[PDB]
Amino acid sequence: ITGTSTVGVGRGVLGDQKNINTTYSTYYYLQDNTRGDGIFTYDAKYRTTLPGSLWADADNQFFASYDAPAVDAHYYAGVTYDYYKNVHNRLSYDGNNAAIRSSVHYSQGYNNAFWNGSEMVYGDGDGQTFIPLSGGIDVVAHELTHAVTDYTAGLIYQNESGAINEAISDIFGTLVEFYANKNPDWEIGEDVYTPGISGDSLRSMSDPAKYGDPDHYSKRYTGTQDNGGVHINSGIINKAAYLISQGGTHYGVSVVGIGRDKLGKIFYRALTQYLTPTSNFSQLRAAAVQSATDLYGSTSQEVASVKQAFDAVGVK
Ligand SMILES: [Ca+2]
Ligand SMILES: [Ca+2]
Ligand SMILES: [Ca+2]
Ligand SMILES: [Ca+2]
Ligand SMILES: [Zn+2]
Question: Which CATH number does the domain housing residue 61 bear?
Answer without folding.
Answer: 3.10.170.10
